[PDB]
Each structure stands twice: as C-alpha cells, then as structure tokens.
Design a protein around this ligand. Structure first.
Ligand SMILES: Nc1ncnc2c1ncn2[C@@H]1O[C@H](COP(=O)(O)OP(=O)(O)OP(=O)(O)O)[C@@H](O)[C@H]1O
Ligand SMILES: Nc1ncnc2c1ncn2[C@@H]1O[C@H](COP(=O)(O)OP(=O)(O)OP(=O)(O)O)[C@@H](O)[C@H]1O
Ligand SMILES: Nc1ncnc2c1ncn2[C@@H]1O[C@H](COP(=O)(O)OP(=O)(O)OP(=O)(O)O)[C@@H](O)[C@H]1O
Ligand SMILES: Nc1ncnc2c1ncn2[C@@H]1O[C@H](COP(=O)(O)OP(=O)(O)O)[C@@H](O)[C@H]1O
Ligand SMILES: [Mg+2]
Ligand SMILES: [Mg+2]
Ligand SMILES: [Mg+2]
Lengths: 1030, 309, 306, 79
C-alpha cells in the first residue's frame, strides 16, 4: 500500500505513529500491539528489504500518512525528504525472535560497564538510554544505535526480530579502533557556508553519469505532461539555491563548449551519492568525452523559445548494431515512436540514444495504433536489449538567427528525415556505463591490477589508438589462444572495447551460414565477411574486428583427405592472410583480434604472420574471489527476476573460503554455481512460505546452500572429465589416527592456503606412499582426501595399465597423466602399486614390458622437474620392497607413512567412536568394555566387521519381529492385509529402529576371529624390517 | 521458434527425439585432430544455445527448453560443456505394481476384454517382468488375436491361453539378440544344505525385500559369500537356482577360461565382467572354479596370477 | 663451439659431440641436462623416455625417423633422452622383439652414410651398460660422465647452493636463511644420503619452521593479548569458544591491500629457520641404499680393466 | 539397418526414410478401415529396430518337409 511519509527526531527504535485511517483498516482490534511493514523507494532498479516496525495510533496525522523516526535509517529530517512511502500489513501480527544479536560498543563505556558488579544493570540501561523494552522492541541489523557510542553488528537468525534477554545474548563487543566516532549515521549537519556569495559566478564541477535509470514518480517538482523527459539532471548540494533559480530550472554552460540545455532537480534524502557533482543521463554526458570537470551556471531563459524548425535531417552513427540488414526495420519504427509523442529538445551537433530489443526485430506488430487509437503497446513486454545512437546533422534553415539551438520538433508542424551515416567515438567505460543505466547484460568489469592478460591486451589497443592519432601507422594484430573453453575471451575483447571506446565488430565464424567444408563456397564465406566488414568499417572510427572461433574456418592442412578438398581449403587459408593484409592497409586503427581454442591447429601461414599471442589461463585464487564478489552483487542477481521479493545474501559468507573450494572452476562454472544457489534459496523460500508467516522481507543465499552447490558442480565437472564418482567420506569416518593426519595436512593443506609463503614453489612435497599392513584404511584414507580437500580424483586401478601390445601400455600411462595434467588441481591414486612398478632387473625379463612400464612412469611422474606440482600422486601397497628403488627417493615418493594396526586401547576406542558416526548406539553399553573384550590383535577392519555383524543381528531380530507381528494380521483368522507391503500397515517407522545391545557385540566377538594371522603379522613385521634407508 | 516463444510470454520449447537434429554424428574412433567433429550440427546446436541464452538472461521465466533423447550421454556433449542443462530424470523400466496398474487399462483401452475368473492381475505382472509399456500393448493384442481365433470363447481369457501366448513372443529389449539361456531353473531342489541355505537366501534377498528399513543403513551391506565343497556336489546347480530366484540378474565366469597366456587379456577379462555388470543392474557375478584364479598366496614368483588377483 | 665459434670453426674433423650421463639415481642428471637450455641458448627437443615405441610393427621406425628429421629441420638442437635404458637395450643374440628395430634405426640416424650434423644427443640413465656397445662407440655418446652422491665435505657446497638459490628474482631469496649460516654442522650430520636428500631436508625444515609464523604455538600471532576478549562476560548461554571465534570472524570486516611487512631478518613475511632447529630434520629423511649399483658402475667405463 | 560407420549425410537419408515409412504405416493403419499391411523380408535382422517393433506376430516360413513336398509334386504333376 502507498501512504505519505514524514520524519522526526526520536530514539533508535521508538514506535512509528500512523494516521487514524491506516490504524482502522490495518490495525486488528484483537492485537495487543500492532506491527507493520514499511518500505522506502530508492534511486535504483532494485528495492531494499522492508523494516518491520512497531506501530501506534496518532489521529493528528492527515489522511493516509505515517511518521517514522529518522534514526531508523540514519537520517536527519533537516534536509529535503520524500513525500510518500510504502506500507504493508503485518501477516497475522506474528513476529519472530532472535538468538545471537550483537552490538558494537565504544571502549570507554564498555570498560566502565565492565567494572560494574551486576548484570541486570546493563539490561535496565538498555531501556534507560535507548527506550528498548524486551519482547516488544524490534531491532534491525547493522543499525547505528548512537553515533560514536554503539552500533548493531548483526541480527540472527533473522535480520529482524524481537528482543528477549532470555533468548537474545545482545553481544556487546568493544570497538577498540573506535571507528564508530567517524561512522556518523548521517552524512553531515551543515554546509560549508550559508551566505557564500550573493551573486555566484559560473562554477566548475564534476559531471558524472547517473548509475541507474530514474523513475518518473520521484521528482520533487511535478513535471509538465509529455516534455523535458530526456534532459533531466539531479544534484543535492547547496548550489541549487546558490544560484537564484529554484529547483526545476535550466542550466546550459556545460564546459562552455556548445551549451547543452538541461533541467536540474534536487536529490532526496536516502541518496548515497557524492555531493557537489551533477548527475546526468547518457544523452547529456555523451557529448563530453574527457573533460571530467565542466563549468556550469544558471540560465533564466524564461521559456524554451523557438519551438518550431521546419524540418530536421537526422543521421545514423556508424556501428556494428546499426548496419545489420535485419535490424533496419525496428530502428525506423522506434524513431517514428521517438517523434510525435512529446516536446523533445534537440541542441544541434549532439547524440540521441535509442534503446530497442534485438529478439523482437525479426517479429513485428501490426499498424493498428497507426490506423486508430494511437498508443504504445506497453513496453513492459519489451525489455530493452541493445543501444544505438543518432546524430542531428541539421542546422535547419528558418527566418531566425541561431535557430539551430534549443528548438523543438513539433509533432505536426515538423518532419524529420534521415540523411546518411556519420562517424564518432562512443563513451569509454570510466566516463560512463550505458549497460548499467539501461540494464543490459553487463560485461564483466575487470580490475587490471589482478588480471594480467586483459591489461596486456588493453595496452596494445591503447597504444594502437594513440598511434592512430600519429601520422605513422603500424599493423596491430592479436590472437587469443587458451587451453580450455569458457575462459571469457569474448568477454575480454568486449571489456577492452568498452574501456577504450573502440568500436566492436563482432562476427562469429560459427554463425556464418556457408557449409563447414566450404565446397565451391569461397565466394560465399569471403563475400559474407567482406560485405559485413566493408559496409561498416570505412565510416567506423578506430575499430577492432573480432573473429570468434576463427579455427572453424582456418582448418589445418589435411594429410588424409581428397586433393580437391585440400586445395579448396588452401585457397581460403591463403586468402584469409590476403584479406588481413588488405584490411590492415586500407584504414588506420583497424585491429584484427582473432580468437582460437587450440593454437596448434592454426596454419603456419597465419601462425607466423600474426604478431601477438596471449595465453588466457584458468583463473587463479586472487581472481575467482573477484568473480564471486561480482556475481553475488545486488545489481546482477535482481536483474533476471521481475518477482516482487528481491534477492540478497547473508554477509557472513567468506568469499575466500568459496574461492578455496572453487579451485579449478571456470567463470561459467561460477555463474552456474551462483544460479543453482539462487535455485535452492528460491525453492526453500516458496516451500516454507506456506507456514503462518515469517522471513517475508527477502529470499537469502546461505553458506550451506553455496557449499552444497559447490559439491554438486565439482562432481558434475568431474563427470565431464571422466573421473570416478568418489563417495562422500570425511575425517569423522576414520579413527585410530593422529600423526598421519598432520602429515597429510602439511603436504596438501599447507601450500593450498597462505600462498604468499611458497612463492617460488620450491618443488613442494610430492609423493604419499601408504605402506604397512593390509586392510587398514588406505583406500579409505584416499577417498577421504579426495572428498575433503576439493581436488579432482583420478585412479589407476592396479595392473589395468598393461595391455596386449608393445607401447600401448605406455600410451595408457601417458594418457592418464595427460588427463590429470589437463585438470591441474588433481590427485592420481595408485592402488596395489607393486603391480605396476615392480623392481627392475628381477623376476626375469618376460619381454621387458614391466621395465618399459616403470621407465615411462618414472619419467612422467616428476622427471621433467618443472611446474609438475599441483598434481599429487598417492599410492598404497601391501609391501614396499616390490616397488623399484628409483621410486623411493624424495621428490617422487618422499613421505612414507607407517599407517597400521592401533595396538593401543585408546586408539581402538577412537576407531569405535569414529565408526559410530551415523550408527545407532543408544544404550547403556559403553565402548570401554567393548574395547576390553577385543584384544589388540584384532585389526582396523575387525571393528568394522564387528559393527556389521551387530547391524546384521539387529536386522535379523527386527526381521523376525516384523514377521511375527504381521502374522497377527496377514493370517486368515485376521484377514486384514496380504499385500506383502506391510510397512504401509506398520506406519510407525520409528518402531523399526534397530539399536545394538551387548548380545550383538558379545556374539560378534565370539563369532569373529582376527582377520590377520599371527603368521601374517609376523611376516609384515619382517617386511617392516626392510626399514627403508637402512 | 525463439521469436514466437519470446512474444508469447512464459513458454516452453519441447523437442522430441532431439538426437535427429542436434545429435552429434559420433566420431566412430576417427581422427580427433580436425577439430574433432565440429560438424554442421554441433554448429547448429551452438547457434541455438547462444540465441536462447540471449533471451534467458533477460527474464528466466520467459523461456525454458525440454530435450529428450535415447540416453543422456549420447546427446551432444556441448550441452554439458556450456552448462545448458543439469537434470537426471530417467524413465526406468516399470516393475511390479506398474505392470498391473496399466495392464488393466490396455485390457479396457479400445477393446473390452474380461480377465480370467477370480483374479486381479496379481501374477499377470509376475510374469513378463521385463516388458516395456510398448511390449504390453502388443502383448494385449496378441492375447486378443489368440483367443479370437479359437472361435469358441471371445469374452474371457484363460490361464492356458496366456501360457500359450507367452511363448513365441519376446520383449523389444533383447528381441534381436536371439539368446536362450538359464533354462536350468531348479529352485525346487531343496538340496541337503537347506539347513544353512537360508543364510544365503537372507544375504541376497532380505536387504531388498525389507526395502524401507535398509534405506537407514549407515554401513555397507554384507554382499559376498564363498562356498567350498567336495568336488562338484551340486555347486553350479545351486548357483543357477539362486540366480533363477530372479531378484538379481546373473552372469558367470569359469576360471580356466580367462587365464590366457597373453599378459594383457589375462587381467582385462576380469574387468570385462565388471564393466558390463555395473552397466545394467545388481548381479551375482558367480565365479566357478575359483581355485584356478586364486594365487595360493604367492609373492616370490610374481606370476601373471598375482596380476590377475 | 658457439661462444668462441671463429676458432672452433677451423678444423674439418667433425666436432666432438654427444654425452652419456650415468650414475646414482637422484644425483642431478635430468637437472644437469635440462639446465643447459637457457645456459647455452640452444633449442632443446625432449624425448620423455619411451615415447617412440608404438603397438604397430614399424611405427616406432616412422617415429624415430620423424624425430630426427624434425631435429634436422630446426638446428642446432640438443636432443635429450630422459632415460636411455628402456629404449635401445643391449641387443640379444635373437629377435628380442621390436627393440632390435629401434636400435638399428638410431645407429643409422646417428652415423649413417648421410650423416647429420649440428645435433647433440644427450643421454642419461642409472644402469648404462645395458645400452648396446655400438651406441657407446666413440663418435657417438662418446664421453661418459659419472655423477657422485657421497662427496664427503663437498655436500656443504651443494647445500649452500640450494639454500642460496635465487631463481625467482622478484625476491632476493626463497628459502628462509638465518644469520649465522653455520651450514657445516648439518652438512656433516647429513651422513651422505643423496643429492636430492638435501633439498628434502631444506623443505622438511621449512615445513617444521613455518608453523612458527602461522600457527605461532596458538599464542604468538593469534589471540596475542588485548583483543582476545572484547565481547563481554557471556552468561546467557554456555557457548564460549565457538561463540568468540564467530564474533572474531564477524568483526574482521575491515579491508586492506598491500599489507607488506619485513619483520624477518632479511625476508618478507616468513619465519627464518633456526639451523639448530633444522638439525631436527636429519633423523627423518632417508637415503636410497644399494651396493649393487656401486659394484655395477665398475663396468661401464672399460670395466676399469681395459 | 543403420550402418552408422558409414559417412554422415547418408545416414540422415536413412533416418528420414525409416521414420517417414513408419509414419505412412501409422497413417494407413489409422486413416483407413481394414488396412493390414502384409510384409515380406529376405532376412529379418536387417529391418531396423525403429520399425521392427511396430509389427506384431511375424511368421517364420520354413522350407517344406516331405509331407508338404508330397502335395506340391501332386500339384505340379496335376492333370
Ligand atoms: N571472467 C568472467 N567474468 C564474468 N563473466 C564471465 C567471465 N568469463 C566468461 N564469462 C561469461 O561466460 C559467458 C560466455 O563467455 P564468452 O562468450 O566470453 O566465452 P569464450 O571465451 O568466447 O568461450 P568459448 O571459446 O568456450 O566459446 C558469458 O555470459 C560471459 O559473461
Ligand atoms: N581404522 C579404520 N577406521 C575407519 N574405518 C575403517 C578402519 N579400518 C577399516 N575401516 C573400514 O573398513 C574398510 C576396509 O578397509 P580398506 O579395504 O579400505 O583398507 P585398505 O588398507 O585400503 O586395504 P586393501 O589394500 O587390502 O584393499 C574401509 O574402507 C573402512 O570403511
Ligand atoms: N645442484 C643440484 N644437485 C642435485 N640435486 C639438485 C640440484 N639442484 C636441484 N636439485 C634437486 O635435486 C633433485 C635431483 O634430481 P635428479 O635431477 O637427479 O633426477 P633424475 O635425473 O630424474 O633422477 P633418476 O635417476 O631417479 O631418474 C631434484 O629434485 C632437483 O630439483
Ligand atoms: N541335489 C542335486 N539335485 C540335482 N542335481 C544335482 C544335485 N547335486 C548334484 N547334481 C548334479 O551334479 C552337477 C552339479 O554341478 P557342479 O557341481 O558344478 O558339477 P561340476 O562341478 O562337475 O561341474 C550337475 O550335473 C547336477 O545335475
Ligand atoms: Mg568462445
Ligand atoms: Mg583396501
Ligand atoms: Mg632421471
């Protein structure tokens, strides 16, 4: 609902007062205390969550008006405010309660209260100072309780909820840095000077772009109908009354170039933008490249005179979008829309932006409105997608002087016509952001300081552009080549275009319709490319011509193909070089920027002639963090969604932890994970909403959902690279272990985090070899490490690597390691490694296959000794002496772990505890005696066998229980149910609960011999006697 | 398509048998070097993905897509590369209750057939367990013809009629293989070891029969059983019967078959079994003559037997 | 032949070329070869062990021939066999499979009638005499060079090298040296395991030491004092440690960049290893022990008899 | 049968013809009363699976045994 708004000075959480009506039709008379939902409009496309506030009646307030405390938003009412707000009734007056609220508090009062001997004193001081009352006062997250004294750090679990000391900790936290003194909730109290100057001269101020489209409603003066929409401007400072002209007046100077008429408004209270600057729309700002600060002054013209110019010959800017055949229709229609609807001010020698949607182009609406009842078919279906500029190109002839400035194109008294195409530069990114303003698909805003390759490319483009101004010219040509798909090379190029304003000619060799083999089609491929370039390029300003997936066309020479195909392919191979030459010659600034997905395929005739090659890597730690911070930003999640409730995230999530988890993921993977998280959040919300009511403000991403999403995306990618489906196992599923955990952490974990230390690599620890006795959790340890450390997992399953030929097993080994190396963060697990790498020069030759195996493995494992880190090889064996000596030396299998039988009571009990995870021990039997029952001779697998025997005994018991229970209903004397699906009849699933008892464990200990012979343990002790290195 | 669905508001495009148009012409182990198989059709698919992703980024409710192909993997891998689709809903072969549930409907679909006296399809589903909802319609028409040609009964089916019609017909799946096996069903043989045969029956069936409870199992199910015996005292026949109980499929290896002299095949033939077993369903994977594979705890000779084990 | 090229281009006799590196595993062979590339500036074609062999009969032949033809297309180039035992073993008195093909191919490509030039074949392996004697004939692989792990009292020189290694010029060091640098004590204590053993010691000690700066005995860098307890006396609930950890993580909402510090002696953000503590790593690292290899090296160099 | 090892752009005609033929099958069966579509094939396997399933109760026609031969000799040698 909509109502009037007013502000007043009051405590932090004083109840809001509402008019008599609002109270009558929204205040439930049975409610002991009334609550509601309040919403504030903002300068932006989205809407913030609404504050849930206590309400009180106030008959003095006029029809449908509300008064709220300014401190609820950190405002002061001593400056221009809004005239309205939004209200929503509370859903059944139900309000949640919080658990772990936190308040920051300055050092002085914190220490002073600390010396006090009593605790309820602070609770009473809450009411004394802040008027807070328990079980009634609703608190909001991040609110400043008092400037320079204290502030709310969080609310939990809900961002809003009731205060109840029996439930809320209200954690007071010392503000040691005392930054709350600087963090005033308000912007300021007074301007620099009230009198300033009686008649101020023209002033130079920064003209910067408004980061969002304005809503016609929130304009303090009421604009006249159908006029002046395109020349709105906004400001907040005292300048509006520094010049005698009031709000809604005009100003023209604009750097004392060709003065551009524009109307200025006042910026309202919540606006967080910078003061003493003029915020302008794209049209006004497009005429002023560079010249960040511009001169401005009042212009009391009285009225926009000379509103009639006979005709006007507008023109079309050169650009990729403009010149397309298909789009030729929609543009003229939207222009005829542009005319005869309002009085638009056209200062000659200026740009005119027009937005449209590409996807609508090939479709059209009828002329129904042109025939009769002329109205726009509501743009609520036309989501603007693409931008194109137009240029006035007309100082029309008329019986007046300087008529080219500040005239109007009357709907009936004037007609506009198109002349020709012209040339200019668009705005650079740092000057303005058209996509943000129009809400297009925002191309990623790289930060040059953390992405080397975009800087390397933009340097080349900027130097080329600057040369263009010089008399000399040089043929700049770049070629982006990357190891794997989806690494943002086209986003790279588009960002490079924006950051410099270089026109982008985007042609994708995929889309071009000529047949792949280009049979008798040279004139088709090349005619298409030639036409689409030369139509736009000559009038194009310095332009990058971007060849996406150029590899499709430029096929390599084929050694196993018919001669005619080879010749016709060589034809295009040569002619592409010739075309590059001729275009580089024809105009200055022409920059050929091709992209490929595998450099090796590009022919020599093009590989050599090309100048610059840029390797675009899979993003590193420092980068994916930024990518996350981008894709979770407010202006990018709300974009896709017209649903009322906005989306956002709990701030407690640590981007760094995500980045750690997201190792090896491409940016598209990151967008996928983000959108899956948004799935989970939305589904959760809609499922839960059917309850009475709570969490209405917004639908929120949460860390657990993100982690689940990561787990999903990881395995889905791993499936894409053909990895096994490693089952979920974690540290809780292993026991009897203390030191080897530390070892594995020191090997894997330590370099993973804190990268600043291992700056040079230093050939980090490389090989983990689990030797020692059999059946002791080695394969478990491996699947645990795989599941826990967020690494892709590849496994060589024993002597699988062998084959029936010479050499092909070495192909196998090279192919496994190659596949590992193409998913760099990875683990290679060798199980029964004694099979694949037996001791050389022993057990006969047998054709030497095993020798050639171990030789290839030895040479690949870490022979090349350069950057081979990032892939860790983990192996396990019954016996190490089978392994060849050359694998034992550090750098290949460096860390040898004696993981083996516990032999100690406490370790046994630890194993019991670990295997008890998810198990149903729910009884007075204790693991102490259970351990005492089974001597140390029993193994690590032994207690799993015992647990499984107990489980199976429980199953047997419950089975006979269920049988004799259903024997009371299935028999003919009962004749109740014979479906053999009795769990529907036994709907009390809890009745099925298996629980172990000393019967189970006792019988198991009776019926479970140690699975390792005294002979076997002796033998493996002897094997240990081959104590490596002695 | 994109224009119309974009204009018509929240909408689906659904493509049946999508492999006929966006399917990859698979490489047939040919050359990968020529940009793999970046043919006309992968090109078309890429175009479509681009053009629909364009709209989808504007408002996610305005379009969705519904592909359908024989199997998930064999649809063009570009779908799973560009992350255009992530769902794993698979139409499994209907079993037990399903069979009955729709048999009746077929019996009353267009013709009006009457079931045999004193039955409710209870065991009609027990037989023809592998039939697909294609096979069932054909089977119904089969029964219709068989009873109609008799000229003396045209209202109610009979048990002997069903027995007759059951032969001379096979499920679509495995129709052309023309394989006959496991005719040795002899469950009726109690044998002497029935005293403890129940343990085997338990460990194979009960975890499946008592399905709901075992969903709560936090520990890997006991699954392997070994059987000594004085030579040939009924062993393969017992295995055959325990197979023919049919709760699980059966395939078996006989130890001396696979012990090739060739180094590679000797081990590769074991993997040959698992690669197939894991690809279908739960299976017995019976080893006969397992003594001949076992390595007699040999460690010194390091013969091929060690490799196999 | 390239640094002083005007002099070495004087003789007609084919420049003495080819080297066979042999001796103990983990003694710098693949290093010493792979380091030549930038030191000299030649090209360095790599043959990572038995890549040549192929299942098809005679495909290995078309592989070796193409290898050498490639090497002859771009010249000069070092040609390094990262091991040379599994390719081209000693020819038996019988077929002995496809290896007798590859051997007789390599000989042909090495000193054939149409003899190549400007190519330097560099071979390494642990057990070299299993290379055919016709590949040891001087004129090919002609100089045999031993490497030795014992080097008693010379292990200091290597240690000092590895610790003072500066490969990444961005920093004037990678390993965190200390001031005294009494490397002699540990060098003697090493007992002569191998050459890679010392790098292993270095990394092991750096691992044992890095916990000082990061873990800090959970008292010297984390919970260092005044900021340990800034929340008040919690009494509403028993959550004591996890509660304070959560509050600390939440309060660390500040943002900083380029937070460099050089509290170390001469290094950035590191805890220099005390060589006295570095002494604790000698009892963990292990050698590779074999007298068979020592005896076996009697043979490759003219059996030390001929 | 689908000899998928054959070159592309041929198998596409194969798919086209197979499916379109089956389309005519269904079209005849449902659009007209009394269509029966007897087929004959020289070897059954070569009929693609996509089409084999549709038909019902295929007949194997064994070669005549001596009892049949007795009647066919009497047919050809008839008056
Ligand atoms: N670093 C990035 N930050 C944000 N979005 C990115 C990034 N890299 C790629 N994307 C997004 O991924 C999608 C596809 O990227 P793009 O078209 O640039 O890929 P490409 O490099 O040409 O890939 P390919 O060669 O596989 O076709 C776009 O939606 C783009 O915004
Ligand atoms: N100490 C233990 N802690 C936890 N689980 C254990 C332990 N010992 C055995 N288990 C469980 O029993 C299983 C049997 O161990 P597993 O077969 O993985 O051992 P292994 O040493 O790799 O043996 P092998 O090399 O002989 O195949 C483990 O996968 C795990 O589920
Ligand atoms: N000057 C040096 N002397 C010895 N080792 C060094 C030296 N500098 C670095 N190292 C390191 O010591 C190890 C020496 O390995 P080495 O070059 O002997 O291996 P390799 O020739 O491939 O051995 P293998 O005989 O086992 O196949 C490597 O980890 C290397 O990084
Ligand atoms: N209880 C039994 N009932 C029926 N047949 C049996 C029984 N016991 C043994 N046989 C016969 O002995 C053989 C059992 O198979 P198996 O023990 O594998 O024989 P073998 O080991 O010689 O191959 C079959 O021929 C089977 O008919
Ligand atoms: Mg691309
Ligand atoms: Mg194991
Ligand atoms: Mg080596």
């Amino acid at each position: 609902m909509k109502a009037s708004l007013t502000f007043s000075l009051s405590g932090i959480y004083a109840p809001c007062s509402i008019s008599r009506d609002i109270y009558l039709e929204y205040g439930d008379k049975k409610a002991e205390c009334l609550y509601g939902t309040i919403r504030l409009p903002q300068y932006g496309p989205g809407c913030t969550p609404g504050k849930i506030v206590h309400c009180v009646l106030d008959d003095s307030l006029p029809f449908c008006s509300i008064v709220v405390p300014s401190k609820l938003f950190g405002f002061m009412p001593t400056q221009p405010t809004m005239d309205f707000c939004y209200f929503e009734p509370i859903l059944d007056n139900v309000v949640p309660v919080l658990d772990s609220v936190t308040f920051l508090i300055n050092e002085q009062l914190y220490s002073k209260l600390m010396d006090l001997p009593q605790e309820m004193q602070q609770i009473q001081f809450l009411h004394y100072k802040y008027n807070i009352n328990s079980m009634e006062t609703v608190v909001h997250s991040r609110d400043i309780l008092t400037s320079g004294l204290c502030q709310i750090l969080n609310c939990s679990p809900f961002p809003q909820g009731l205060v109840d000391f029996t439930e809320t900790q209200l954690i007071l936290v010392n503000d040691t840095e005392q930054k709350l003194s600087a963090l005033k909730y308000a912007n300021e109290d007074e301007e620099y000077a009230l009198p300033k100057i009686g008649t101020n001269s023209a002033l130079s101020i920064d003209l910067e772009s408004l980061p969002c489209t304005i809503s016609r409603d929130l304009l303090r003066p009421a604009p006249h109908i159908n006029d002046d929409n395109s020349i709105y401007a906004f400001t907040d400072a005292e300048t509006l009354l520094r010049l005698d002209v009031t709000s809604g007046s005009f100003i023209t100077v604009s750097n004392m170039g060709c003065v551009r008429l524009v109307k200025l408004f006042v910026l309202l209270l919540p606006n967080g933008f910078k003061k003493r600057t003029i915020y302008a729309p794209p049209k006004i700002i497009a005429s002023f490249p560079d010249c960040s600060v511009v001169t401005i002054s009042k212009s009391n013209i009285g009225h926009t005179d000379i509103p009639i110019a006979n005709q006007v010959f507008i023109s079309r800017v050169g650009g990729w979008l403009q010149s397309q055949k298909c789009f030729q229709n929609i543009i003229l229609t939207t222009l005829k829309k542009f005319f005869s609807e309002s009085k638009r001010i056209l200062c000659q020698n200026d740009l005119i932006p027009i937005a449209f949607d590409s996807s609508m182009a090939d479709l059209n609406i009828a002329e129904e409105n042109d025939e009769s009842d002329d109205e726009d078919e509501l743009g609520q279906y036309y989501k603007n997608d693409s931008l194109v500029w137009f240029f006035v190109t007309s100082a029309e002839l008329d019986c007046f002087s300087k008529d080219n400035s500040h005239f109007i194109i009357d709907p009936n008294r004037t007609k506009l016509i198109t002349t020709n195409i012209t040339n200019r530069r668009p705005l650079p990114l740092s000057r303005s952001n058209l996509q943000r303003y129009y809400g297009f698909a925002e191309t990623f805003y790289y930060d040059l300081h953390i992405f080397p390759y975009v800087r390397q490319l933009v340097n080349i483009l900027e130097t080329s552009f600057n040369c263009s101004q010089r008399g000399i010219t040089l043929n700049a040509s770049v070629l982006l080549h990357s190891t794997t798909n989806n690494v943002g090379k086209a986003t790279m190029v588009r960002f490079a275009s924006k950051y410099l304003g270089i026109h982008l000619l985007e042609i994708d060799c995929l889309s071009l319709t000529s047949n792949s083999r280009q049979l008798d089609s040279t004139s088709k491929i090349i005619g298409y490319i030639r036409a689409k370039c030369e139509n736009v390029l000559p009038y194009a300003s310095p332009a990058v011509i971007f060849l996406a997936h150029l590899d499709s066309i430029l096929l390599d020479v084929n050694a196993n193909q018919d001669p005619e195909a080879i010749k016709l392919q060589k034809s295009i191979n040569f002619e592409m070089s010739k075309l590059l030459d001729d275009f580089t010659f024809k105009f200055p600034g022409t920059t050929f920027v091709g992209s490929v997905n595998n450099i090796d395929n590009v022919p020599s005739s093009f590989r050599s002639h090309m100048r610059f090659e840029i390797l675009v890597p899979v993003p590193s730690e420092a980068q994916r963090l930024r990518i996350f911070q981008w894709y979770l930003s407010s202006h990018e999640l709300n974009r896709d969604v017209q649903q009322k409730v906005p989306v956002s995230y709990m701030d407690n999530i640590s981007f760094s932890s995500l980045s750690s988890y997201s190792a090896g993921l491409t940016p598209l993977d990151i967008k996928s994970i983000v959108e899956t998280a948004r799935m989970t959040a939305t589904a959760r919300f809609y499922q839960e909403s059917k309850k009475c009511g709570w969490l209405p403000q917004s639908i929120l991403i949460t860390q657990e959902d993100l982690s689940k999403a990561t787990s999903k995306a990881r395995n889905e990618f791993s499936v894409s690279i053909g990895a096994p489906q490693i089952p979920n196992v974690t540290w809780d599923d292993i026991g009897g272990i203390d030191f080897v955990k530390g070892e594995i952490l020191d090997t894997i974990d330590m370099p993973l985090k804190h990268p600043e230390l291992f700056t040079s690599g230093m050939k980090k620890r490389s090989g983990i070899l689990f030797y020692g006795p059999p059946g002791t959790g080695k394969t478990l340890m491996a699947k645990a490490i795989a599941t826990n450390f967020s690494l892709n997992f590849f496994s060589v399953k024993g002597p699988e690597l062998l084959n029936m030929y010479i050499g092909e097993s070495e192909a196998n080994v090279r192919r496994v390691f190659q596949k590992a190396r193409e998913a760099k963060p990875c683990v290679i697990f060798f199980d029964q490694i004694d099979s694949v790498a037996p001791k050389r020069g022993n057990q006969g030759d047998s054709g030497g296959v095993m020798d050639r195996i171990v030789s290839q493995l030895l040479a690949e494992l870490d022979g090349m000794s350069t950057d081979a880190d990032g892939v860790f090889v983990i192996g396990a064996t019954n016996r190490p002496d089978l392994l060849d000596e050359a694998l034992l030396r550090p750098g290949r299998f460096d860390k040898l772990l004696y993981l083996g039988i516990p032999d100690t009571d406490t370790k046994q009990l630890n194993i019991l505890e670990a295997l008890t995870r998810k198990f149903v021990l729910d009884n007075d039997v204790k693991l102490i005696e259970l351990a005492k029952l089974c001597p140390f001779n029993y193994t690590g697998a032994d207690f799993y066998a015992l647990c499984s025997d107990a489980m199976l005994n429980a199953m047997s018991r419950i089975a006979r229980m269920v049988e004799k229970k259903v024997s009371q209903h299935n028999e003919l004397t009962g004749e109740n149910i014979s479906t053999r699906r009795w769990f529907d009849k036994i709907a009390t699933k809890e009745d099925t609960k298996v629980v172990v008892k000393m019967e189970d464990f006792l019988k198991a200990q009776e019926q479970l011999t140690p699975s390792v012979s005294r002979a076997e343990l002796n033998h493996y002790e002897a094997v240990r006697a081959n104590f490596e290195g002695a | 398509w994109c224009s119309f669905c974009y204009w018509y508001g929240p909408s689906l495009i659904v493509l049946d048998n999508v492999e006929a148009l966006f399917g990859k012409p698979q490489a047939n182990d040919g050359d990968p070097s020529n940009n793999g198989q970046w043919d006309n059709a992968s090109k078309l698919l890429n175009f479509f993905i681009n053009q629909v992703t364009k709209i989808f980024n504007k408002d996610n409710k305005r379009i969705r897509v519904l592909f359908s192909g024989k199997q998930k993997t064999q649809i063009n891998p570009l779908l799973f590369d560009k992350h255009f689709v992530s769902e794993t809903w698979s139409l499994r072969a209907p079993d037990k209750h399903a069979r009955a549930k729709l048999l009746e409907y077929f019996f009353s679909k267009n013709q009006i057939m009457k079931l045999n006296r004193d039955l409710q399809f209870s065991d009609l589903s027990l037989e023809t367990e592998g039939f697909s909802p294609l096979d069932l319609e054909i089977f119904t028409e089969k029964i219709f013809y068989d009873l109609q040609l008799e000229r003396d009964c045209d209202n109610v089916v009979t048990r002997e009629l069903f027995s007759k019609s059951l032969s001379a017909f096979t499920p679509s799946a495995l129709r052309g293989v023309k394989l006959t096996k496991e005719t040795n069903i002899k469950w009726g043989d109690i044998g002497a070891l029935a005293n403890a045969k129940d343990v085997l029956l338990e460990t194979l069936e009960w975890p499946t029969k008592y399905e709901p409870i075992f969903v709560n199992c936090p520990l890997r199910l006991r699954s392997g059983i070994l059987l000594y015996g004085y030579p040939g005292c009924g062993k393969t026949l017992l295995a055959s019967a325990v197979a023919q109980q049919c709760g699980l499929n059966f395939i078996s290896v006989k130890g001396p078959e696979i012990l090739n002299k060739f180094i590679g095949a000797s081990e590769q033939n074991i993997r040959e079994l698992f690669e197939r077993a894991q690809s279908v369903k739960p299976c017995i994977l019976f080893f006969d003559e397992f003594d001949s594979i076992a390595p007699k705890r040999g460690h010194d000779s390091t013969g091929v037997t060690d490799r196999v084990v | 032949p390239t640094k002083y090229e005007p002099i070495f281009v004087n003789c007609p006799l084919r420049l003495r070329s080819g080297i066979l590196l042999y001796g103990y595993p983990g003694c710098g062979k693949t290093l010493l070869a792979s380091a030549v590339a930038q030191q000299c500036g030649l090209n360095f074609i790599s043959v990572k062990g038995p890549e040549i062999l192929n299942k098809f009969i005679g495909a290995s032949e078309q592989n070796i021939r193409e290898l050498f033809e490639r090497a002859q297309s771009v010249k000069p180039c070092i040609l390094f066999f990262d091991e040379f035992d599994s390719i081209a073993p000693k020819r038996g008195h019988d077929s002995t499979g496809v290896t007798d093909r590859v051997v007789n191919q390599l000989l042909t490509q090495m000193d054939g009638a149409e003899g190549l030039d400007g190519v330097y074949i560099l071979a390494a392996t642990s057990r070299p005499d299993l290379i055919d004697s016709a590949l040891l004939r001087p004129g090919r692989l002609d100089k045999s060079v031993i490497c030795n792990i014992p080097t008693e009292s010379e292990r200091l020189d290597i240690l000092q090298a590895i610790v003072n290694s500066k490969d990444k010029d961005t920093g004037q060091k990678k390993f965190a040296l200390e001031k005294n640098a009494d490397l002699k004590l540990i060098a003697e204590k090493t007992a002569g395991f191998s050459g890679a053993d010392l790098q292993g010691l270095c990394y092991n000690a750096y691992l044992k030491s890095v916990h000082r700066w990061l873990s800090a005995a959970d008292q010297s860098e984390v919970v260092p004092g005044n900021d340990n307890i800034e929340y008040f006396s919690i009494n509403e609930h028993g959550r004591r440690e996890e509660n304070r950890l959560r509050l600390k993580t939440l309060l660390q909402q500040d943002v900083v960049h380029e937070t460099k510090t050089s509290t170390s002696a001469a290094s950035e953000l590191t805890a220099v290893v005390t060589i006295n503590d570095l002494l604790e790593a000698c009892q963990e690292t292990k050698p590779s022990i074999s007298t068979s290899e020592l005896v076996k090296l009697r043979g490759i160099y003219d059996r030390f008899q001929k």
